[PDB]
Amino acid sequence: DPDKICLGHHAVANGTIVKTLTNEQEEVTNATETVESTSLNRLCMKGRNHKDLGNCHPIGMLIGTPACDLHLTGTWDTLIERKNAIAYCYPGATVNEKALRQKIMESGGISKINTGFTYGSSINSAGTTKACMRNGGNSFYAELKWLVSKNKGQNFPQTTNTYRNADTAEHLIMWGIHHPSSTQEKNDLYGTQSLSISVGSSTYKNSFVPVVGARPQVNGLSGRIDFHWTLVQPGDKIIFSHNGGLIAPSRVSKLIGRGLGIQSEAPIDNSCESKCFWRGGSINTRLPFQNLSPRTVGQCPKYVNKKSLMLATGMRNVPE
Amino acid sequence: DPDKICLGHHAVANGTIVKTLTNEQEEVTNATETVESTSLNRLCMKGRNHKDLGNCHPIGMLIGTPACDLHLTGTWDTLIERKNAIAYCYPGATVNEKALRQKIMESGGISKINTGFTYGSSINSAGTTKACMRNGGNSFYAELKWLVSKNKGQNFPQTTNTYRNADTAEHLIMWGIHHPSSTQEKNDLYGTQSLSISVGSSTYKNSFVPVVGARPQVNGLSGRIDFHWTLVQPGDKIIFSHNGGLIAPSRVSKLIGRGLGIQSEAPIDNSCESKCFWRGGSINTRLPFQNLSPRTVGQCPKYVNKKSLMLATGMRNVPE
Amino acid sequence: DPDKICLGHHAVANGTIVKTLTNEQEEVTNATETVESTSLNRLCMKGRNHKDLGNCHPIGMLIGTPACDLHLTGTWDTLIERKNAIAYCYPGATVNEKALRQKIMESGGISKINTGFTYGSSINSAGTTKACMRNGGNSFYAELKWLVSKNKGQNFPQTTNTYRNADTAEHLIMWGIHHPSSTQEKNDLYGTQSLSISVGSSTYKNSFVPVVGARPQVNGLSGRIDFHWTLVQPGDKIIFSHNGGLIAPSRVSKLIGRGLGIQSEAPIDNSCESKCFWRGGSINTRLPFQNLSPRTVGQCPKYVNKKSLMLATGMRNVPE
Amino acid sequence: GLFGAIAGFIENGWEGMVDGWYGFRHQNAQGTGQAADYKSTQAAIDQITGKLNRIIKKTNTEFESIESEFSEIDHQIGNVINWTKDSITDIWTYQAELLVAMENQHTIDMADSEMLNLYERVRKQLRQNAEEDGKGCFEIYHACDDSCMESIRNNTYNHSQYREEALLNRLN
Amino acid sequence: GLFGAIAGFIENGWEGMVDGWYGFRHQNAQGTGQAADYKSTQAAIDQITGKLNRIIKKTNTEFESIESEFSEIDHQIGNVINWTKDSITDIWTYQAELLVAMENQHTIDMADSEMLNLYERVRKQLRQNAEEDGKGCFEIYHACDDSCMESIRNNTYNHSQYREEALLNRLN
Amino acid sequence: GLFGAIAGFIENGWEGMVDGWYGFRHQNAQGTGQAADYKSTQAAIDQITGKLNRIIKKTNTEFESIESEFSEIDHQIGNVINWTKDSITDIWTYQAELLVAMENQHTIDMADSEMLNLYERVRKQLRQNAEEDGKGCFEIYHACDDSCMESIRNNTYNHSQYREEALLNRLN
Numbered sequence A, B, C: 001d002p003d004k005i006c007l008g009h010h011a012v013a014n015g016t017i018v019k020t021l022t023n024e025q026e027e028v029t030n031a032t033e034t035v036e037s038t039s040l041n042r043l044c045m046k047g048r049n050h051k052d053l054g055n056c057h058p059i060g061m062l063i064g065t066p067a068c069d070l071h072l073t074g075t076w077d078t079l080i081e082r083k084n085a086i087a088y089c090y091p092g093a094t095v096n097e098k099a100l101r102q103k104i105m106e107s108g109g110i111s112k113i114n115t116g117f118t119y120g121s122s123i124n125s126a127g128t129t130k131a132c133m134r135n136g137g138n139s140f141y142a143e144l145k146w147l148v149s150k151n152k153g154q155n156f157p158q159t160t161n162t163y164r165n166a167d168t169a170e171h172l173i174m175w176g177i178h179h180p181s182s183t184q185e186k187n188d189l190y191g192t193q194s195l196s197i198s199v200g201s202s203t204y205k206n207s208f209v210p211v212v213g214a215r216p217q218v219n220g221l222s223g224r225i226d227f228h229w230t231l232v233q234p235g236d237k238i239i240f241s242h243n244g245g246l247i248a249p250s251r252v253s254k255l256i257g258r259g260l261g262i263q264s265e266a267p268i269d270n271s272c273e274s275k276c277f278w279r280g281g282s283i284n285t286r287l288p289f290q291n292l293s294p295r296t297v298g299q300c301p302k303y304v305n306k307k308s309l310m311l312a313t314g315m316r317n318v319p320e
Numbered sequence D, E, F: 001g002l003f004g005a006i007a008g009f010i011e012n013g014w015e016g017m018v019d020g021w022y023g024f025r026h027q028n029a030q031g032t033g034q035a036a037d038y039k040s041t042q043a044a045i046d047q048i049t050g051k052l053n054r055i056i057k058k059t060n061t062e063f064e065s066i067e068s069e070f071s072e073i074d075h076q077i078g079n080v081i082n083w084t085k086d087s088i089t090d091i092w093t094y095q096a097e098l099l100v101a102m103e104n105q106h107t108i109d110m111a112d113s114e115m116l117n118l119y120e121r122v123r124k125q126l127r128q129n130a131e132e133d134g135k136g137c138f139e140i141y142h143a144c145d146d147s148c149m150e151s152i153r154n155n156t157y158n159h160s161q162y163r164e165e166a167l168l169n170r171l172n
């Protein structure tokens, strides 16, 4: 009678189901997940000189909205914008707002440079509003000045202000145009004369006229202040010629370097690191794919429309 | 000699050629197509509450062009636009037309709400034109009113009209500005005064001036009516201040839900069903790829630059 | 003892390392590169009716900048644009400049057609400038005319000019608006009257006003000439009405057919053929991938973030 | 091919085998036989059906229009859309070509393996009672009647029943 | 499967074998035993480790936002971005599904091949002293004690020592 | 590897075989020799040539510029282009890596299979006249001169001619 030697392989009691090219329900001894389903509900900021803007909107950093008083200058590698952040305390909007916000969120810092703009005795440069409260009192955008006639009703004087870029890098200059609520208000602030504001550099020009059309109240205000911007190149100058309606810059901005802009509601955590962020928080997975969100920033796993994709790490399970 | 048992496999007389990793001309027993080459020459609308606009252009639904009289309101899951569809009976254009058309073609319906605008005795609100015929008579856009001076040559009065959104959803409001063919015409309709139309809401404002400059006749008319639009949010007002040139809305629109916008020349078929459409008709194939067109809408097979891709469904064919 | 026959396979002393699914350091007998790393440092123009623009910017071909005098008309299947090419001799810019350049760089040629515009005896239609020199003499854009009052300070007369497209293909018309350096200059060139330029076709309508706001000198000139353009459809007319400030077209352009636009720094070589071009020259590889640049035009290998990817062309190397 | 049976040591296929993909032909004293093998046939068919279930399908993603059929499109965005769509089409064309080439290679080799696995199963059953002729047949060195042949097809052939007879004939 | 051993001629796996992926069970006149095979087990594990090293990773490309979370976007560009992102998602979803399906097929068949390669090594070691039973075992036609069984397991079995005895027992 | 021959039971390759990919070395009374096998070599080369024909190619899609080399681009559209282009590059880099890794695995295993198919061909030719040594050699139990060795390489060896001599030497 012959002796016997038998060749065999292992098996497990609890096998795992995977998909193959030919079988949707193939049982293997072990498998591992390739799609990340979990996220840390926090912004993992270790190893990052970060700035959390809070209720400050990125554009508010350039104009100096009261909510942005602690964010007027700085440096960072990561900038965090939040939901319902305030840019415009006084009602209005910025022309080419989306391009501006992206420029700020792409940057690694903001510096400020004095324009040196000064005004004669017949201009009141200290115009304020209840819309922009500071220290429990009427105030204004910190980087701008609301110019009005010193004496109510009198013609605002024909004025020229020139900012010279004496730096080696481009400077971002912003200004506003006030659009009064009525002819009577317009006359009180700037006089009965026809108003005209012109702005001119070597690479930009535009002209503006305050409009006095009827419109509804936004936080009790029918007036509007709309913002405009341009880049003043190194060695160039920009000339403002105006006779009422200009909201004039006290300072210009310089965007420094590059950084990662994040839009999220999750709280900061300096205890841990991450390279991938989304609205709900951070993704610290080693896996190649994820199903949390198609909207991510940084160095991320690729988004897929799948709950799970199990990769086999063992042979076919053929139990006893 | 010994008995014998022979192992073998089937073959077929007429095999099919497929491509493999190593062989461009590999003969197999059977194969099946993976790229769809054929299309039904009709729009398969089974199980769809659809609207075929015919010669009505989507924007004409909002302003009320005569061709759109049966498409001013409704509900749908699928909206079909045709070639050479009419939007503007009177010569003109809509500012931000492409965004507006896309909004309409994304919608699942339109509801109309009265503005309630009234006009005093020195305005003729029943201005009409031979460009916009209805039942053999001179007419006008159904959702707007052409306001002119009652007395020819007399100054059109300084007029105010205000629409408040009393609904819980945003309303789309449209208006026109008439640009006369000459100074004499402008004087006849609106008087010798300088003309200005102001429009103001919480989220929008603009001013318009009718222009008289020379331009060619389009169907005998050098005049133009250009359309403008904005979204009025729930609870917000929009104020029209005008003294000649406004084409004022009698109703506003509310876009309801979402639907699939199709642009095609193919006829409707209620017997057939489909989830993929293109210019030439419908694609109701089960196959993963198609070579009919790169421009499709709905749930579609992916477009590929290939006539055929045969997938083997059998072994190598080795005939006797 | 038995005789012997032994089965075996070849090997090489020095194998090549490749990556597989299961091994990043797999030695094989031979392998071949799949990612192209080298480029030809020339634009290979054999078999192509090509135009090298040199220091002529595509837009300068339409307006007739001095640098473009050899390139005002022509035919081509390939158009080559160079770095620091000149569009504007006089300070200014074109509205919708990016779309215009792309249209020209997609074209297969330019033809020029006379507008036929004429001007009364009180207009000097041959205005020139030191900014636009031709061989040490003051000149102007060849396809345009700088219209000014013949008598200094006199009102420029109201003028209306019409170009009709008598062709069966669309024509591209350009014009400029002069924005003077000051009120005094404006008065000298066009008179004290209020200035207005109207442009109107069946498909286009616009109005322009020269602006005299203070701005810095560019090449010693605070004035600006900004360009505007539109397409004139077959059989349509475009009407210019003006009383000072129009830089009027003397010819219009017709873009002929289609061609490949190339932006490159590489010199021309008429002895080699190619289908793929980039900033640094031509890519004539048979390989599927390349790592030269993500910006290429024509029929190209796909860009990959990889230095090398070796494809095995032999068995595992198992040396003695 | 990879497993050396189909278009390999088996010279050609059988057009007369219509009730299966793989099977048996035999010759004994009783007669000439042919029969399909169900398990190997079904194994191949099930694997191909699995591929067809995975491949013959589209995504459920709903796409809307970004290119107007009947109206003009903006020039800058139009060029971006054209570039993007053509880039996406090159990817899908490439993926489709690679998918089908890879699947066809695997289908062919899978079918070859099932042929070899049937051949190997029969070889091991026959043990020392038969010898391979090199063309996919086994010369059986004992009287193997229709019931014997059916037991081979059934995987219930016991080599020990015929071993003494077979070894005497093999060694002569 | 492709190589015919795992879920093939080997009827089932051994849940008791907890120190290896492949191995041996023996029966002789002195008793029974079990032992794992190190080399075949490690060959399979190393290949799976290799796949995991290649697959479990992300790209180092840094992406920035093109869709505002807390603000509106332009309607035309927003539609293009939505179309593009959904097209890219369909590609990556498809690629992920194909990757894992293809890799899983190869892992299963690779494991099958290592089982067969061990079986084949043992067959050639035993030469004319044993015969295959068709179930993954070899019936050895001489007394093969625990040391003999160990020599088979560690690839030092010399057939020539037992050949005289084995051939007489095989031919009876 | 998958088929167990190359870097498997064949200990190593032959650097001295320069006229083929696979071949024979023999030993008889006349001496030793070497010869390449044409059929197996060409089968492997033709499959690799087929891969190269499919892989070494580009698309015929004509792409135009959407990014200005020498002038400014729009900030919103530029960001979308950058996102799209980097997304497309990640896809092609991934596809290129997967293609070459998969193809390399298949090329190696294909070459292994052709070695095994040659070995199997010879095994079946020799029938009961030879035995496998476990290292890719067959020990032939009869006088096999240079012409006999040629007949094995030529696939014209008739086992019946030498069977009586061989069985006497093998079994006694």
Ligand SMILES: *[C@@H]1O[C@H](CO)[C@@H](O[C@@H]2O[C@H](CO)[C@@H](O[C@@H]3O[C@H](CO[C@H]4O[C@H](CO)[C@@H](O)[C@H](O)[C@@H]4O)[C@@H](O)[C@H](O[C@H]4O[C@H](CO)[C@@H](O)[C@H](O)[C@@H]4O)[C@@H]3O)[C@H](O)[C@H]2NC(C)=O)[C@H](O)[C@H]1NC(C)=O
Binding pocket: D147, D148, D150, D151, D154, D156
């Ligand atoms: C390979 O595998 C196949 C599939 O499993 C086996 O095929 C079966 O074989 C058995 C045995 O031959 C078959 O069973 C037999 O069916 C005969 C016919 O039955 C019908 O007709 C008779 C006569 O009119 C009726 O009496 C009966 O009710 C049916 O309507 C019977 O005649 C057989 O019965 C006789 O033999 C058995 C012993 O085998 C005795 O117990 C009885 O008393 C009687 O004398 C028997 O029942 C069965 O039908 C086959 N199945 C199929 C699906 O084809 C092969 O046997 C197997 N081969 C080998 C070599 O292993």
Ligand SMILES: CC(=O)N[C@@H]1[C@@H](O)[C@H](O[C@@H]2O[C@H](CO)[C@H](O)[C@H](O[C@]3(C(=O)O)C[C@H](O)[C@@H](NC(C)=O)[C@H]([C@H](O)[C@H](O)CO)O3)[C@H]2O)[C@@H](CO)O[C@H]1O
Binding pocket: A126, A127, A128, A129, A130, A131, A138, A146, A148, A179, A180, A181, A185, A189, A217, A219, A220, A221, A222, A223, A224
């Ligand atoms: C019926 C109705 O609501 N009518 C509004 C009318 O109320 C509104 O007047 C403004 O109302 C707000 C309410 O908080 C303030 O009282 C405005 O006063 C100030 C301001 O705080 O903003 C005072 C401030 O000193 C002024 N600053 C300067 C530099 O002049 C400003 C400024 O004049 C205006 O903001 C310019 O528009 O106003 C008070 O004017 C008016 C104006 O919004 O609109 C009616 O429809």
Ligand SMILES: CC(=O)N[C@@H]1[C@@H](O)[C@H](O[C@@H]2O[C@H](CO)[C@H](O)[C@H](O[C@]3(C(=O)O)C[C@H](O)[C@@H](NC(C)=O)[C@H]([C@H](O)[C@H](O)CO)O3)[C@H]2O)[C@@H](CO)O[C@H]1O
Binding pocket: B126, B127, B128, B129, B130, B131, B138, B146, B148, B179, B180, B181, B185, B189, B219, B220, B221, B222, B223, B224
């Ligand atoms: C010989 C020649 O070329 N003559 C044209 C002359 O036809 C043209 O006058 C216009 O002619 C068209 C017919 O093609 C209409 O009759 C215009 O009349 C109407 C209209 O139907 O559009 C009458 C209508 O009642 C008017 N409605 C209102 C509210 O006023 C409108 C309206 O005034 C204009 O549409 C506003 O632009 O016009 C008729 O004006 C003249 C002037 O374009 O030019 C000659 O060369």
Ligand SMILES: CC(=O)N[C@@H]1[C@@H](O)[C@H](O[C@@H]2O[C@H](CO)[C@H](O)[C@H](O[C@]3(C(=O)O)C[C@H](O)[C@@H](NC(C)=O)[C@H]([C@H](O)[C@H](O)CO)O3)[C@H]2O)[C@@H](CO)O[C@H]1O
Binding pocket: C127, C128, C129, C130, C131, C138, C146, C148, C179, C180, C181, C185, C189, C217, C220, C221, C222, C223, C224
């Ligand atoms: C005191 C002082 O610094 N004054 C400068 C004054 O010189 C300068 O005027 C321009 O100076 C340049 C210097 O080369 C030219 O002389 C300009 O003349 C021309 C021109 O070449 O551009 C002459 C030309 O014949 C004119 N053409 C027509 C059709 O009128 C043009 C044209 O008037 C202007 O370009 C229109 O803007 O000018 C001369 O104008 C000015 C620059 O703004 O600044 C003073 O401070």
Ligand SMILES: *[C@@H]1O[C@H](CO)[C@@H](O)[C@H](O)[C@H]1NC(C)=O
Binding pocket: A012, A014, A029, A030, A031, A032
């Ligand atoms: C499967 O692998 C995991 C590691 O991912 C390990 O924790 C677990 O013990 C394994 N399970 C089995 C049954 O082998």
Ligand SMILES: *[C@@H]1O[C@H](CO)[C@@H](O)[C@H](O)[C@H]1NC(C)=O
Binding pocket: C030, C031, C313
């Ligand atoms: C690979 O094969 C080619 C073509 O036969 C040959 O010319 C070359 O020598 C090999 N490659 C290398 C690097 O030796």
Ligand SMILES: *[C@@H]1O[C@H](CO)[C@@H](O)[C@H](O)[C@H]1NC(C)=O
Binding pocket: C106, D074, D075, D076, D078, D079, D082
């Ligand atoms: C996009 O491609 C179409 C053809 O599919 C072509 O007609 C059109 O000119 C292209 N778009 C642009 C903006 O050039």
Ligand SMILES: *[C@@H]1O[C@H](CO)[C@@H](O)[C@H](O)[C@H]1NC(C)=O
Binding pocket: E074, E075, E076, E078, E079, E082
């Ligand atoms: C893009 O998709 C988002 C999420 O589905 C949706 O809210 C938005 O309406 C889409 N954008 C446009 C412009 O329709």
Ligand SMILES: *[C@@H]1O[C@H](CO)[C@@H](O)[C@H](O)[C@H]1NC(C)=O
Binding pocket: F074, F075, F076, F078, F079, F082
């Ligand atoms: C797009 O990428 C290029 C190259 O990295 C970079 O120079 C440019 O700033 C990017 N575009 C924008 C709008 O930031």
